[PDB]
Amino acid sequence: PSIVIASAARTAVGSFNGAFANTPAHELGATVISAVLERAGVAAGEVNEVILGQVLPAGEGQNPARQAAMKAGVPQEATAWGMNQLAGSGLRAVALGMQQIATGDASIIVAGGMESMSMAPHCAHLRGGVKMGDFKMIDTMIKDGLTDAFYGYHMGTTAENVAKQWQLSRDEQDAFAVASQNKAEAAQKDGRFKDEIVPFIVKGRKGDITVDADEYIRHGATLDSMAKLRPAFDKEGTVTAGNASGLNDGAAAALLMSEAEASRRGIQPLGRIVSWATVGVDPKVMGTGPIPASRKALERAGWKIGDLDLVEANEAFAAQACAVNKDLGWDPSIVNVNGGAIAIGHPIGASGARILNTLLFEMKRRGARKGLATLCIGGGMGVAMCIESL
Amino acid sequence: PSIVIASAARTAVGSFNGAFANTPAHELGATVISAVLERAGVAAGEVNEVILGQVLPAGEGQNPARQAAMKAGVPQEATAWGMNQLAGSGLRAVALGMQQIATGDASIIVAGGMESMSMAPHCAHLRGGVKMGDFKMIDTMIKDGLTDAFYGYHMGTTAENVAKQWQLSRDEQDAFAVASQNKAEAAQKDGRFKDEIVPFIVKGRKGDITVDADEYIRHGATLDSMAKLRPAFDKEGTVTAGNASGLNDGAAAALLMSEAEASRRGIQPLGRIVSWATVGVDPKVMGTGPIPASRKALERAGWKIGDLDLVEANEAFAAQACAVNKDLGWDPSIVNVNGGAIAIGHPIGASGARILNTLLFEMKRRGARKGLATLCIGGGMGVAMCIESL
Amino acid sequence: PSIVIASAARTAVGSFNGAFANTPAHELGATVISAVLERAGVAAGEVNEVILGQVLPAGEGQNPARQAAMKAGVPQEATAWGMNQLAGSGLRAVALGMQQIATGDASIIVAGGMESMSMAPHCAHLRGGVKMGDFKMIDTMIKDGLTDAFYGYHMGTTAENVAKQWQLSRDEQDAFAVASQNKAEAAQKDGRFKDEIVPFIVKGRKGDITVDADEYIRHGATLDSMAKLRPAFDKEGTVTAGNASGLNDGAAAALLMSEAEASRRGIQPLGRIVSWATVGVDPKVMGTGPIPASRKALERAGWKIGDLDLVEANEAFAAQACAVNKDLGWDPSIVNVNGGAIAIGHPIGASGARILNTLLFEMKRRGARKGLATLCIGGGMGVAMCIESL
Amino acid sequence: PSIVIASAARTAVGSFNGAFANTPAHELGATVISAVLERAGVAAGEVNEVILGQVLPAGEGQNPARQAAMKAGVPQEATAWGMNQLAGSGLRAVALGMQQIATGDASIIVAGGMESMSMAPHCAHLRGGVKMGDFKMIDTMIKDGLTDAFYGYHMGTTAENVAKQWQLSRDEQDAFAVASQNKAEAAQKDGRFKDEIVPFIVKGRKGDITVDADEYIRHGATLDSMAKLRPAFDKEGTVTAGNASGLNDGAAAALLMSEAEASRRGIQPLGRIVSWATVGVDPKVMGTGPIPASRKALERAGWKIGDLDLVEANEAFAAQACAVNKDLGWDPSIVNVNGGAIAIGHPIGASGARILNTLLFEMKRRGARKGLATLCIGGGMGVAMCIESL
Ligand SMILES: CC(=O)CC(=O)SCCNC(=O)CCNC(=O)[C@H](O)C(C)(C)COP(=O)(O)OP(=O)(O)OC[C@H]1O[C@@H](n2cnc3c(N)ncnc32)[C@H](O)[C@@H]1OP(=O)(O)O
Ligand SMILES: CC(=O)CC(=O)SCCNC(=O)CCNC(=O)[C@H](O)C(C)(C)COP(=O)(O)OP(=O)(O)OC[C@H]1O[C@@H](n2cnc3c(N)ncnc32)[C@H](O)[C@@H]1OP(=O)(O)O
Q1: Is CB count within 10 Å lower at the N or C end of chain C?
Q2: Helix (H, G, I), strand (E, B), or coil: what is residue C156?
Q3: Which chain regions cross the lipid bilayer (chains A, B, C, D)?
Q4: Are residues C200 and C293 in the same domain?
Q5: Cβ contact (<8 Å) for C57 and D126?
Q6: Using a CB-CB distance cutoff of 8 angstroms, which residues of chain D are in contact with residue A126?
Q7: Are B171 and B85 in the same domain?
Q8: CA angle, corner A279, sides to A273 and A280, nearest 5?
């Protein structure tokens, strides 16, 4: 069983309280699903199921994955469900949809992730009531999306654990965060984000606004701007607003069918899916996931690391990214070539569906036979997926 | 591939704000995880991945699937995620774990669902700031759990729609409710729930308490007690609190491995998952969900409906319950043999693993060979699984 | 000018989240206004102004004093206002009422206080908009009621400051606390709170409840009960939940008019206001306020301490009550004869009027000619009033 | 007994979330207390009591009046309290101050009001808990300040009710509004608010800002810009954002003492308090309050309406201001000569002292012998004060 990605589409990544400040995630998910179908000329009524990862659904209504699907006119017959591997959420959904087809329980899947971090509420358990005293209204975005459940600290503190263990400096992490801005701003001028991006219409009261640009890419980054920042996590630390990724909005997807099914419908696929994998690492050093998780995908497929021609390794942080870059020892010239999540941004639940899209469209453009996407996960996991263009 | 349910367990079901009014889901989760590990004779350190369905995770923190696994003594090298097909979730995860093994990506999965509706917070988007005027604190249990996202009313109003369609009188709905309470009260006194129930110790400042008994079952439910209430959703309707299920907290799971992997180890499985299916219908009549699902399941197993010896079909509402039974035509004596959710309760994400456990253990207890699990789903779906005893 | 208290009344004092847990303060106030009218034989039409002290009106709506008056049927042509000198309020309002009549601006005043500490809300300033992370919902009872504005600590910490300066042992404070409970119980049992209490009907869906007993008074309070408690404010402190007053709900009032006005109407008044005073003291030892205030009241009356026949000195804390009695040196057997606030409760803005009602109705029953009510006040003040029988 | 206002002062009136956006009301009051002292040449040590009207003190901590007085160096031996008669507050506190001196209980009183509508929190009663279903976080500014407690509608609705009863057109309201702005602008440019205003230093982190101008006053207000607004309260209405006052922050105060005392000190007082009055009306038409209150004040003074040389009548709403002027029939050319609240702003509990400050300083400037200040009050009341020059 060979399961292909016939099409792929992603919204631009927005900035926290930015383009998509008041846009429910499922609206963004609605546009990517319509966009994969439109691109593959498959009608929404041919879609068996919609699998969207999502970390931050509080307030958004029953099963926002279904809410996306219905708004893109996937009929009532089809099915939709969410899931959560935090930041591996959006790429694991592609694996799960891939698995729906190899097991012969669905014919055509649309799988990705969606994320409105801007729209995440504050919350508090108030059923028993609060007999007396102050309490905290909690930011679900931070609590459910960015804080470890086991130690109680921010994910910036787990990338910092990788900065002392691998001895990565404050200079070296500025040289990756600037080099991801530089690579990404080049990309954006060059139009290389055009193909993958499907524009989204933010419906306003005094005028619509079509968003087709990733707005968290700061233009023309020097080094002295990065190296004059103040650590956001430790107070004698090395991770900062500039070498860590952002908080973002965004949705992203891929359209799945068997390889036989694409070629019947006259569809030249972006890739085949050849393997994946998911492993666990010490939570304290959660950024290291992409290492064992790339290894096991690369073993399953039957590929080495030197084989690879193109790689996305989500830059949740600059500490974690460099560490996965070092241990695996692959050519860093082919890694995050149109930049990564520092510059682009990091919409948690969508982000793995993002870097899958960037790789598949850049793989097409440049002529790379073998790609790899990978994402470190909070709690200490890694996830990966080896691709092969036809 | 031929996967088998080696072991299974669940907590008792808690009343709304009752025994587990302050117990986080993942705590209830860890207890059921430890349970199936110990019941199969597999050590936590052999588990590859934990899949928990869960509908209402806001405030609990990062990926409660990982929190339940790590607490239960599963080692950091394994992985963990959750998902949301609403009331279908807890059975869906078992099917999702079956595909990991079938696809050659996991040896051994723990799969089920967990839900604390007690612990679901209220919430509000408060980033913009509220310059003036009231804003709503939104009950996430009601918003994300029980409210249709397209039609804007409760699930119980969809039960009015199904009742109106199927011409199911109030007197009929109350007679299904009282039976389901009478079956469950009978099964409680007779220890038919003891096997599957694993006690949960609620730790407290002032005394540990062991919960080993479903507390939502009302003893000696009479036809008058059901017939004295008012309609809860429609002011000239039929659906009341007596003939719908409640708001509850619990968890439930199953350790899945290939059939061969069980034999090596001397485990006597509680079932082979022969076939599974999920179908979509109109959100207005979401209770009809089980109908196309149970029929597609049966088609995938190559079974006729008259081949089943046992059925658990989830009792969200006595209106939809009566109707699903009416269509499929199976003997109602082999349906919810030990009562259903009206009596036992309806902890949403957990329900699908809840009824599966119930089916598995009565399937063992009476020597039934063929069994089917099914659940209706908000926003217009159903899910279903055949189990066959070894 | 010679001003009399023609009539007085109070609700029973409710326990925190007890009998009045969901009764707005103005509803309690409305019953006492109606009662002082009924007791004097004065019609609501004849009232000029209602003045009600109240510390925690947040969320009750515009000017709760006007709500209470309107509810009691005081005509729209009268006026009403609220005021806040913390625990002084309910007494200070009476003096303020006296001054309307003494300056010829009113003939007929209803004055006192009202408080629902149970109904006091949690709050936060949210107009700016909170960009990110967690914020504090503030208990307005604690913040606006019980915390010193200059030093940041609870009123109980000022009770420790007084326990330290006056060298007041834990066992001395406990014996006082116990004696307060035992004298309150004896008075309650003997019917001594009957004349002052007007019953309050708590209107309830499933039945109305008449509350006519002070429910905070513990029956059979033992010295061992007090002795076993942990210090509530300082870990090597002496002040506990037992030897401090509680958090409580109630209202109390007095109907005033000139002595010649009472004479024409043939009313036998409860008392003439001979004098009153308010003084400040250091916030840190706020419980000492009654010292300077009572001395100043007595000076203004032309009375010696030895001339008093009965005293209500409010029992915020055993520590401060003991300091006060020690310094003034009045005969302790004439002070809080029927118990005090440790036993009865401390509904802040209402307590001044509460202990005036107690003073006035014991004065009448025992035939005492000369009386004095006094209270300490948060932020460092006291208030005192001298009453003589006609 | 003759009471004089020896001195007076006010902060500039701040725009809602404008200059004083994060300044607690007691900090504004502390600056005005300091200023009346300095302007009278009276030391803070000689103050007996501070009395500050305030409607919205939730979350500011214990008795903000005491907080203001202490910050101003008023010694701990003095006393301070707050009161609430809504927009009547800041004036009635002055009459209450007078009465303290008039009955021989104090020699020296600072009295007025302070309000921060910007700092007023949102709130909710959460003590019992919220077992299920949505609940509102209530804007305390709207709930406690601006909503009628009997009818449940905003004060702007009482204004409409007055517009309809007095048959006041939109065009007439708009005219009056534009006249208020144009007159306030003129008075501001010409320096007429300089004497009354004390500057307030907003303490910053990146620099202090000195505020000494009333920032709500729109410069170059056009009739067109009033006329184009949509009714704010009634969709076929008349009352708009433009012909209503605003939501504002500010404080104001007067230092009082006897006339014989000011003579001893050699103070030339701003005025003698000759009479005051407060009267109730129907809540539905509360804007009319000033009518019977001014009449009652004039009758107490022994004055005819035509004896007045200057008047401040608060402009809560153009509709009610116009009705007041119609029924009383005083020359509109002597009313709100420097504009009113539509232009200047309406910090509720501070406004009655705000307009007293404007009457007094204009009375001084023009040599006007007889004045009157009056306000309407939510819930159906009025307050008025007569002032004579010495
Ligand atoms: C503001 C002003 O201007 C004027 C003033 O006068 S300042 C005074 C204002 N009022 C105050 O400061 C209130 C003082 N009291 C308090 O703050 C609170 O009651 C407190 C903090 C001291 C207690 O906190 P709490 O969490 O509500 O505990 P609470 O339930 O009341 O009692 C604690 C325990 O002691 C027990 N207890 C209470 N009173 C007791 C007594 N008299 N004897 C024996 N046991 C007692 C209770 O049963 C409870 O036992 P359990 O936990 O096993 O059930
Ligand atoms: C409590 C008591 O006892 C006594 C009393 O007297 S009650 C009186 C107390 N106060 C009140 O009742 C408050 C009355 N006012 C309000 O509640 C509010 O200001 C209001 C509801 C009327 C308006 O509030 P809002 O929703 O924020 O609208 P707001 O932004 O202030 O104004 C809307 C428009 O009016 C316009 N506006 C107002 N005056 C204008 C003028 N002179 N020229 C041009 N435009 C003007 C603004 O330009 C604004 O346009 P934008 O949308 O482009 O910004």
Answers
A1: N
A2: helix
A3: none
A4: no
A5: no
A6: 126, 129-130
A7: no
A8: 155
